[PDB]
Amino acid sequence: SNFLIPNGTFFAVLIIFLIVLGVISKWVVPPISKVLAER
Amino acid sequence: MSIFIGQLIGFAVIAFIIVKWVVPPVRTLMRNQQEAVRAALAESAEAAKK
Amino acid sequence: DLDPNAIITAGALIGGGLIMGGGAIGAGIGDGIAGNALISGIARQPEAQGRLFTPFFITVGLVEAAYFINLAFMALFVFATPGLQ
Amino acid sequence: LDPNAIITAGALIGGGLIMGGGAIGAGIGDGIAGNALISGIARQPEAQGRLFTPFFITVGLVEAAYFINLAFMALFVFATPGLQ
Amino acid sequence: DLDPNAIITAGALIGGGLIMGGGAIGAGIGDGIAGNALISGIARQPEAQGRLFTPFFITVGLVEAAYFINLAFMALFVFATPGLQ
Amino acid sequence: LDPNAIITAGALIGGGLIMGGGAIGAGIGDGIAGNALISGIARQPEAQGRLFTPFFITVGLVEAAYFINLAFMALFVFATPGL
Amino acid sequence: LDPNAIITAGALIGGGLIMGGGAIGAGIGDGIAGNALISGIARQPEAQGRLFTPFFITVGLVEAAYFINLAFMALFVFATPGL
Amino acid sequence: LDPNAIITAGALIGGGLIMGGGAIGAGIGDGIAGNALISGIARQPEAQGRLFTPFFITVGLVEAAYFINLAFMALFVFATPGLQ
Amino acid sequence: DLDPNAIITAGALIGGGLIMGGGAIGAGIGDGIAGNALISGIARQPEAQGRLFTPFFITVGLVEAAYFINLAFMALFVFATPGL
Amino acid sequence: DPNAIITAGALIGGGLIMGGGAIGAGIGDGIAGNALISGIARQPEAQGRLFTPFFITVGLVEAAYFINLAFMALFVFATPGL
Amino acid sequence: DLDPNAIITAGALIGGGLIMGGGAIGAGIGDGIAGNALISGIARQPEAQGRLFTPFFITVGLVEAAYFINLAFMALFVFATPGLQ
Amino acid sequence: AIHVGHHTLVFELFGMTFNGDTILATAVTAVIVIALAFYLRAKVTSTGVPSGVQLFWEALTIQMRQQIEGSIGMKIAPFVLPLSVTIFVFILISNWLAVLPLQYGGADGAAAELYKAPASDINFVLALALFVFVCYHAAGIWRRGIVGHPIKVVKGHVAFLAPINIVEELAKPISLALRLFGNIFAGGILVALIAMFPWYIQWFPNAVWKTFDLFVGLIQAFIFSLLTILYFSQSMEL
Amino acid sequence: DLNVEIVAVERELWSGPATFVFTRTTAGEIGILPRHIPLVAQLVDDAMVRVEREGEDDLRIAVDGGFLSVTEETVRILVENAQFESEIDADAAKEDAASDDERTAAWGRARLRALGQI
């Protein structure tokens, strides 16, 4: 019940996402950009 | 239990449909991109040889 | 005497029914119109089809929202009815 | 007056509304998409096949809503929340 | 001091009327729009008549499809009212 | 509060809803079909006759739903189920 | 309270729904048909007369269903079924 | 629970429904006919004189229904059938 | 038991709400369509503005008039409720 | 309670007012925006030229909307006949 | 013998349901129409994408605003119901 | 019953409640994304033929790029691309994992899901939407200064419509979040409703619904990512 | 009545009053009457033009490279080439249709339409 109201999970999720973002920030996107520029 | 069996059968049907119809075309596109990059690298090597 | 919760839940069910009615009508009309635009564009020039999928999927996104958002609120009406007492 | 009676009456009316809106939306959307497809086929006779792939997506996007609503009827008539 | 089945049947009748009215509205609008497409095509390309019937029958099909489900739901509501005491 | 009385009241409200929906659908569909016919004739006046045949297949089908409404409305009002 | 009062109240609401639906259908259909007619006239003025033959066919049709609602709505408020 | 109260409630609901429906129909029809007229005049100013003749016809068909609504609507509230 | 005037007022407010809903829908849609026609005419032809307002205004009248009618008559529902 | 019934009717009426106003305003704005988008696409240099009539129409539509807003405010808060 | 708050709550939920039905219909149809215009513009001029946003964003904007205005007042009807007693 | 809701593995910390099920679902999605990233890094080969994961990642990057430059160039918004591609793959994996057969019976006559998509919880969608909201609001801020950002957003494209513009600055986050929630939440209900039928009749409608839900999840992920990029461009202009 | 002028590149073909001008533009069949709106359209690859006067047999012309230009005062069909029904020989119209070349096949189809074979 009371679905709309967010719990503390709101914060925790961000952490997870941020962590994922970090990888995509450095260890996924830049290598692929280098690969495409090289190609 | 019973609902679990029904859901498992549904998932099996979904997987069968995917492998039968959508997997072949996505695999074909993957292979096409692989062949395109292979041809590009081969043409680069041929240009170096020339 | 009649249970207050009973009448409150009846009103909530009517409200949720209206939510679905409006949301589904809007979604159907918007999807039809956007698909008409996409089909006409593709028919007029097939070579452009690849591009039209970008704006089209924007339109549906700006339409389905107005519908699916309502769905969320409908839940709030039916499953956790405010002032259910 | 059994409360479940009022609950069920409200649920029936709500479901009627749900399907009324669902059918209005689905019918009008499918009609509009089919109008586009028919005009396209008339303009380019051979385009018909290449027009199905977008058109069906529209249909898939439309019927979805209808299908979704078609479920809630059960949820409203056979599993009325808060029936008590 | 009232028969619950009376309220149940009144609600079922209201719901079924909503069902059938919405179905009729959708069917009529979609049929008219598809027919407009067909008539324009026939006017512009009379030779295309044989070609245009095939998609048109599809367009009406779905447009009529939904309608019949609502029609079918009459059986579920005005004769087999769920939740009837 | 006679049960059958509430039955009939609900049936009348229903019948009214069915007629409203059917009239809306029939009117709008007929208007759209007539618009197509008029535009076609205006662009190509000589095609008038050949346009009537498809125009009916549309209109002749539109009211197919509308009249159906009438039918069930009778079942709603004149012979109300559960009365 | 008198059940017949409930019957006639439901009849009034049903008649209102009937007449509103008929009005919406007639207005939309007549507007669309008139738009087609005006566009055609702006296109081919010499087809003016030739355009009224289809236009009226639509009009009378669009109005026809509408008038049926009247032909029934009065009944609801004057010969109420189940009264 | 006075009966005439229910009579008046139903009559007013029906009258409001008819008035709203007539307003919708008149507004939509007038807007559509006006769009046709405006486009026709834009294409060719000379036609402005001509287009009024068909345009004014359409409004007559539309407004009539609307003005009929009011009329019949006036029947329900001012002299409600079945009222005692 | 309940005061009859309570039911009368409730029904009158519902009727006024319906009248406003219908009038707003009709006015908004018709005005939008007329404005679409005017905008398209101006875009496709720059200087017809001086003429394009002559029909467009008429059209808006034919639309907005109806709205006002509803508005005016809705007052009767909410203030001079029949059979109050 | 007479006040309860009259107030419930008032809220339902306000809901109808806002539903109709929302439908009208949203669809009218969509149609006017369709006109403006088409005009811009065909005539990119008419931007300022096209703003004028488009805002005329949008202002009228929003005026109808705001009239509905004001009358909903009257219904819900200053409900007559309380 | 019914709780006045119960009747007020039922009325408030029905009103909110109507507000959101209307808002959903308006938003969906307006966004669909604007998206149709944008898609047609893209089909005719593939490079117009950017210049077509300033129109589109305006239209959607207006539309969305109206819808969301309704949203706010629906909450006002439900969570803080005027006249509730 | 339907038991719509009923977050499992709930706990409390620092006076605030946390939903264990959604946290687990987002953790699974994040670890899958990180595993794919590591697999790509291991099999990154520009000179050689790229691996399948490389094909997928470069396809996503090329797409998000194309839309970016179509809206605004990289040099203006270099960091948007990683953000959008992240959002995309994360949401897509979250929605697609649900297709797995993790539905069982609780012995109560109601179905239960071992893995429930985080988007079906308001917390996840709110987190994503507010993250994007802050991100592009700050982007516009330092694109045109703290003082000018509120002024431009309030005036919008046309100043005299200032009130309406303000509502949009509030609408975009909510519209970004709620829609996603709904798009997934329905599925959570739908599957549960599909559990009403027996297995020999439940298999088919569930099959059809999940087959469509795959496309639904893909479309919603793409829509959210594209709208994120689009709002980023809107906030970063002139 | 409206002034029909079928005109080719090399010379003028036919001119005079008419009551109806039916043809097949790219968008679709169009019939022009005396007060049609000004218009510019491209005839289909195998377009045929039928002209109807007040009580005279229709002229059916097979047109290649046709462009239709209607004005309130005159109506013109600028054709790359155009041949009338009387001069059109059925054997050639039949044999050259559906040939290897699209242009020649379209010309043959236009000739057949002018004759009536279509």
Author numbering:
A (entry chain b): 22 to 60
B (entry chain d): 1 to 50
C (entry chain O), E (entry chain M), K (entry chain P): 2 to 86
D (entry chain N), H (entry chain S): 3 to 86
F (entry chain L), G (entry chain T): 3 to 85
I (entry chain R): 2 to 85
J (entry chain Q): 4 to 85
L (entry chain a): 10 to 247
Task: Recite the paper's sentences.
The membrane domain of the mycobacterial ATP synthase is embedded in the IPM, with the catalytic F1-domain of the enzyme extending into the bacterial cytoplasm and attached to the membrane domain by a central stalk and a peripheral stalk (PS). As do other ATP synthases in eubacteria, chloroplasts, and mitochondria, the enzyme couples a proton-motive force (pmf) across the IPM generated by respiration to the synthesis in the F1-domain of the enzyme of ATP from adenosine diphosphate (ADP) and phosphate by a mechanical rotary mechanism. The mycobacterial rotor consists of a membrane-bound ring of nine c-subunits, attached to an elongated central stalk, made of single copies of the γ- and ε-subunits. The mycobacterial PS is made of two proteins, bδ and b′.
Extensive classification of the data for the mycobacterial ATP synthase revealed the presence of not only the three main states referred to as S1, S2, and S3 but also of substates within them. Substates S1a to S1e are in S1, and S3a to S3c are in S3. The positions of the top of the PS suggest that the order of procession is S1a > S1b > S1e > S1d > S1c. The main differences between the substates within each state are that the positions of the PS and F1 domains vary such that the F1-domain (including the α-helical coiled-coil of the γ-subunit) appears to pivot around the PS during the catalytic cycle. Pivot points are located around residues 59 to 66 in the b-subunit, residues 34 to 41 in the bδ-subunit, and residues 43 and 233 in the γ-subunit. However, alignment of the substates via the “crown” in the F1-domain shows that they have identical nucleotide occupancies and that the position of the γ-subunit is also maintained. Alignment of the substates via the a-subunit demonstrates that the c9-rings and the membrane α-helices of the a-, b-, and bδ-subunits of the substates are in identical positions, as are the ε-subunits, and in some instances the lower part of the γ-subunit. The sixth nucleotide binding site in subunit βE contains an ADP molecule with neither accompanying Mg2+ nor phosphate.
